[PDB]
């Protein structure tokens, strides 16, 4: 009873994703601190609109790792520009470790629970992320009273119920005795997408732009020889290749890492490239003069 | 002091931040979002690394009235050196898309926090341009030709989006679209080649219109534009020279190599055909066998 | 060759392993390793220069 | 051949292994190793040959 | 099961808790690595004279 | 996507032997002997040694 106690869908905006990665990757090999500013609506929806980075702390992430001088000043600056939002959580990194809360980080979550009891704790690894979907998970505490008397699960109702999880390690131990994980949902508009797609006007100008023809001849030369040398490799493939079982032929005549497939790719890249080069040249002739 | 701003690289953090910030003040109807941009400056490459709003008002009754809070700029500096000392004020973004002369005077203000000339980074947030989502200009002061005075003016200096590496990771994550222009396969670049012709053609159309308005409606002759156009006429391909003729020989050289490749594939594709028919040959026999084999199965049930 | 067993050989001194750990007990445990790969012939060579 | 302390034995080990490995097994597609010597008094007794 | 598991059975494990995956009946030894390059001899009684 | 993992940064290790076509056993230069998955359409015709 009392609190709903179902884990939020955290909607992190595009600005807030990129900003977190920016402060994390400069700071490696070290931890980073920061406060997450958003709006909370519904009974399980937090929208993390923006973030701000708390300067690098000399003791690392802890319960003293927010200085009240920076904090107050920083939120005061957002109030003068109308960018103001409310602290709905906190972020911290482990720079070399995947997502979980150490003893200190859970104790920090106990403090942020006081201020807002739907608070999120987001753990960002800055360097382990190559997709940028991965190694960002959000956690939110489930009530203490809930833990004891075994009314702990109640996060599976009022969500999709598609869960994404891995690791036993610290992660899982953290889960059982404290918090519940749910995936990071990404929100965007088509104005943020539109900005990314453009990369100047030299994006399209380059399609007309034609390289040195010294280079083209070189690429085409290499490719011609390559197809002969792989045709011979393919000749060995059809040396007989009529003995039993397909699997024993694959290993024997090198049907694994197939010479037929290799010829095919080689031909196509060159064929299509020279197609565009003839076309762009002809375009140039007729268009200019 | 330095006049070094020849290349302006933009992190994608700056363009999405300017998109948010316009909407967190709610400026509209030729009201503007004026904030700071930070990065590195005093250098040949400028990297625009970050952006923030500032308090700012824009009056439509007279453009020489706006508000700016100076104390905000001094307090934001203290904070940003703690996060990152590689970040410093390098100038200001302006929402645009219209550049004005009063903006030169805002410019002067920003010349008192950075040694270099401030960069005024026009970021269109209204998304009217299908290209240029960044245009960059820097105020420089020079004696203009043709009996003209010393003018303080905003000259275009090259800019491109290039992204930081740390930024990249998120750019990859948020782009999950197929990308009509990405420079892919044969297909992707035939769509491009057409797009590219209409790009250039429209750019060429602006030049025509401009020229007409100089002698019709008496626009001020700006001799910089006109100088560039002399070289346009001087780099025109001229036919009937041995160069053009060698280019037509080279189109056959290239198509020659394309022909040999096309035959080579015809053998692969026929190889695949041969190999299926062998399978089907076998399968005819296997299906035939089932019919015989039933008899053998039926007989056992009766016996046992 | 004719025996039809796994002629492993083993060249030189066997203190040479050190990059997963020392060669001061792969002599000993050789007994075990050889047993596993039955039927196996160990050509533990050491030309001798210990005097 | 010496092995007076442990540190005589280490030099010896390098000699042993050089000979055994020298040698052909699968047979050499190299030119077989070249060596230079100020004198042969400080080579082995008969293991070069 | 403990039934499948014998002593001297090589087993694969995880990094998150070392829980088993599969039994292996393969053995990776410094001896195995030396054998593996050399492979079998091509020698026979008459490759060696006298 | 796979091309990125394929590319730098990497840590060197040393292939021992296969235990399965799609899981092999290696030892890293960090000092840890790891069972590791093998990405397909890698030359497995030189991987086995």
Curated annotation (Swiss-Prot), chain A:
Q: What are the residue boundaries of the MPN domain, all occurrences included?
A: 10-145
Q: Which UniProt keywords apply?
A: Acetylation, Hydrolase, Metal-binding, Metalloprotease, Protease, Proteasome, Thiol protease, Ubl conjugation pathway, Zinc
Please indicate the residue ranges that the annotation assigns to the motif JAMM motif: 92-105
Q: Where does Zn(2+) bind?
A: 92, 94, 105
Origin superkingdom: Eukaryota
SUPFAM superfamilies membership: JAB1/MPN domain (SSF102712)
**Which EC numbers characterise this protein's activity in its record?**
3.4.19.12
Q: GO molecular function of the protein, one example?
A: proteasome binding
Give the catalysed reaction(s), semicolon-separated: Thiol-dependent hydrolysis of ester, thioester, amide, peptide and isopeptide bonds formed by the C-terminal Gly of ubiquitin (a 76-residue protein attached to proteins as an intracellular targeting signal)
Q: What do the Gene Ontology cellular component annotations say?
A: cytosol; mitochondrion; nucleus; proteasome complex; proteasome regulatory particle, lid subcomplex; proteasome storage granule
Q: Which Pfam families match?
A: JAB, RPN11_C
- According to the UniProt record, what class of enzyme is this? hydrolase
Q: Does the record's keyword annotation contain Ribonucleoprotein? A: no
Q: Does RNA-binding count among this protein's keywords?
A: no
Give the record's PTM text: N-acetylated by NAT3.
One GO BP = peroxisome fission
Summary of the function given for this chain in its UniProt record: Component of the lid subcomplex of the 26S proteasome, a multiprotein complex involved in the ATP-dependent degradation of ubiquitinated proteins. RPN11 is the only catalytically active member of the lid and serves as the essential deubiquitinase of the proteasome.
> Which family is annotated?
Belongs to the peptidase M67A family.
Give the misc comment: Present with 16400 molecules/cell in log phase SD medium.
What free text does the record give on domains?
A: The JAMM motif is required for the deubiquitination and degradation of ubiquitinated substrates.
What name is this protein filed under?
Answer: Ubiquitin carboxyl-terminal hydrolase RPN11
Recorded name of the encoding gene: RPN11
Curated annotation (Swiss-Prot), chain B:
Example of a GO MF term: metallopeptidase activity
Start and end residues of each MPN domain: 8-143
> Keywords of this protein's UniProt record, alphabetized?
Acetylation, Phosphoprotein, Proteasome
Alphabetical GO CC annotations of the entry are:
proteasome complex; proteasome regulatory particle, lid subcomplex; proteasome storage granule
Q: Does the keyword ATP-binding apply?
A: no
Q: Which InterPro entries does this chain map to?
A: EIF3F/CSN6-like_C, JAMM/MPN+_dom, MPN, MPN_RPN7_8
What is the superkingdom listed in this entry's lineage?
Eukaryota
Against PROSITE patterns, the record matches this protein to:
MPN
Residues in the signal sequence: none
Q: For the modification N-acetylserine, which residues carry it?
A: 2
Regarding how it is modified after translation, the entry says: N-acetylated by NAT1.
* Keyword flag Transcription: no
Per the record, the GO terms for biological process are: proteasome-mediated ubiquitin-dependent protein catabolic process; ubiquitin-dependent protein catabolic process
Q: Which family does it belong to?
A: Belongs to the peptidase M67A family.
The remark listed among the other comments is: Present with 19800 molecules/cell in log phase SD medium.
Known role: Acts as a regulatory subunit of the 26S proteasome which is involved in the ATP-dependent degradation of ubiquitinated proteins.
Q: What is this protein called?
A: 26S proteasome regulatory subunit RPN8
User: Species lineage, top-down?
Assistant: Eukaryota, Fungi, Dikarya, Ascomycota, Saccharomycotina
Curated annotation (Swiss-Prot), chain C:
The entry's localization annotation reads:
Cytoplasm; Nucleus
Q: Subunit info? A: May form a homodimer or a heterodimer with a related family member. Interacts with OLA1, TMA17, and UBR1.
User: What further fact does the record state?
Assistant: Present with 4700 molecules/cell in log phase SD medium.
Q: What's this protein's name?
A: 26S proteasome regulatory subunit 8 homolog
Give the family, as the similarity comment puts it: Belongs to the AAA ATPase family.
Its post-translational modification remark reads: N-acetylated by NAT1.
Which stretch of the full sequence is covered here?
A: 204 to 254 of 405
Q: From which residue to which does any coiled coil extend?
A: none
Taxonomically, which superkingdom? Eukaryota
Report the function annotation for this chain: The 26S proteasome is involved in the ATP-dependent degradation of ubiquitinated proteins. The regulatory (or ATPase) complex confers ATP dependency and substrate specificity to the 26S complex.
From Swiss-Prot, chain D:
Task: Tell me the compartments it is located in.
Answer: Cytoplasm; Nucleus
UniProt modification remark:
N-acetylated by NAT3.
Q: Which residues form a coiled coil?
A: none
Family according to the record: Belongs to the AAA ATPase family.
* Known function: The 26S proteasome is involved in the ATP-dependent degradation of ubiquitinated proteins. The regulatory (or ATPase) complex confers ATP dependency and substrate specificity to the 26S complex.
Report the protein name in the record. Answer: 26S proteasome regulatory subunit 6B homolog
Gene assigned in the entry: RPT3
Q: What stretch of the parent protein is included here?
A: 282 to 330 of 428
């Amino acid at each position: 009873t009392g609190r709903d106690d179902t884990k939020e869908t955290v909607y992190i905006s595009s600005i807030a994703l990129l900003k977190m990665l920016k402060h994390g990757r400069a700071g490696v090999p070290m931890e980073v601190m920061g406060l997450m500013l958003g709006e909370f609506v519904d009974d399980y929806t937090v929208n993390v609109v923006d973030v701000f980075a708390m300067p690098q702390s000399g003791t690392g992430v802890s319960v003293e790792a927010v200085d009240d001088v920076f904090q107050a000043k920083m939120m005061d600056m957002l109030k003068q520009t109308g960018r103001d939002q409310m602290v709905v959580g906190w972020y911290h990194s482990h720079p070399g470790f995947g997502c979980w809360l150490s003893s200190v980080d859970v104790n920090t979550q106990k403090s942020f629970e006081q201020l807002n009891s739907r608070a999120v704790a987001v753990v960002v690894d800055p360097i382990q992320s190559v997709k940028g979907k991965v190694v960002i998970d959000a956690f939110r505490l489930i009530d203490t009273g809930a833990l004891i008397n075994n009314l702990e699960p109640r996060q599976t109702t009022s969500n999709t119920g598609l869960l994404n999880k891995a690791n036993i390690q610290a992660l899982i131990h953290g889960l059982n005795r404290h918090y519940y994980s749910l995936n990071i949902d990404y929100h965007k508009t088509a104005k943020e997408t539109k900005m990314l797609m453009n990369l100047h006007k030299e994006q399209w100008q380059s399609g007309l732009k034609m390289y040195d023809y010294e280079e083209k001849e070189e690429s085409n030369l290499a490719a011609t020889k390559s197809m002969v040398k792989i045709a011979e490799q393919y000749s060995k493939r059809i040396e007989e290749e009529k003995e039993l079982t397909e699997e024993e032929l694959k290993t024997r005549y090198v049907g694994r890492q197939d010479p037929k497939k290799h010829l095919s790719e080689t031909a196509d890249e060159t064929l299509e490239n020279n197609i565009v080069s003839v076309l762009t040249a002809g375009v140039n002739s007729v268009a200019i003069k | 002091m330095s006049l070094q701003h020849e290349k302006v690289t933009i992190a994608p953090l700056v363009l999405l931040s300017a998109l948010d910030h316009y909407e967190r003040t709610q400026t509209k109807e030729n009201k503007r979002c004026v904030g700071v941009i930070l990065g590195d400056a005093n250098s040949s490459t400028i990297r625009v690394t970050n952006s923030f709003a500032l308090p700012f008002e824009e009056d439509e009754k007279n453009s020489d009235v706006w508000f700016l809070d100076h104390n905000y700029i001094e307090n934001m500096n203290e904070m940003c050196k703690k996060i990152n000392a590689k970040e410093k004020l390098i100038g200001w973004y302006h929402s645009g898309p219209k550049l004005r002369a009063s903006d030169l005077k805002i410019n002067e203000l920003f010349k008192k926090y950075t040694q270099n000339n401030p960069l005024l980074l026009i970021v269109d947030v209204k998304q009217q341009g299908v290209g240029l989502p960044t245009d960059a200009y820097v105020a420089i002061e020079q004696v203009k030709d043709d009996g003209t005075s010393t003018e303080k003016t905003f000259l275009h200096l090259p800019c491109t989006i290039e992204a930081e590496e740390a930024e990249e990771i998120g750019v990859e994550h948020l782009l999950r679209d197929v990308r009509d222009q990405a420079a892919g396969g044969l297909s992707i670049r035939l769509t491009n080649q057409l797009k590219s012709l209409k790009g250039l053609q429209s750019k060429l159309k602006d030049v025509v219109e401009y020229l007409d308005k100089v002698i019709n409606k008496e626009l001020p002759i700006n001799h910089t534009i006109l100088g560039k156009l002399q070289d346009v006429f001087n780099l025109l391909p001229n036919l009937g020279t041995p160069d053009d003729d060698e280019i037509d020989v080279e189109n056959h050289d290239r198509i020659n190599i394309s022909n040999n490749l096309q035959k080579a594939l015809t053998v692969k594709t026929n190889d695949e055909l041969m190999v299926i028919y062998i399978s089907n040959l076998v399968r005819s026999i296997i299906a035939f066998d089932d019919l015989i084999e039933n008899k053998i199965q039926n007989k056992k049930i009766q016996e046992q | 060759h004719h025996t039809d067993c796994k002629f492993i050989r083993v060249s030189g001194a066997e203190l040479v392993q050190k990059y997963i750990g020392e060669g001061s007990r792969m002599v000993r445990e050789l007994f075990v390793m050889a047993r596993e790969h039955a039927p196996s012939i160990i050509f533990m060579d050491e030309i001798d220069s210990i005097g | 051949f010496d092995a007076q302390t442990g540190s005589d034995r280490e030099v010896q080990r390098i000699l042993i292994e050089l000979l055994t490995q020298m040698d052909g097994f699968d047979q050499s597609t190299n030119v077989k190793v070249i060596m230079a010597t100020n004198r042969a008094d400080t080579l082995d007794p008969a293991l070069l040959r | 099961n403990v039934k499948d598991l014998k002593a001297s059975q090589r087993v694969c494990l995880r990094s998150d808790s070392y829980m088993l995956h599969k039994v292996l009946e393969n053995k990776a030894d410094p001896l195995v690595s030396l054998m593996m390059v050399e492979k079998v001899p091509d020698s026979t009684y008459d490759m060696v004279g006298g | 996507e796979v091309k990125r993992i394929q590319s730098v940064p990497l840590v060197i290790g040393q292939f021992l032997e296969p235990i399965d076509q799609n899981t092999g056993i290696v030892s890293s230069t960090t000092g840890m002997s790891y069972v590791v998955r093998i990405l397909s359409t890698l030359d497995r015709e030189l991987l086995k040694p």
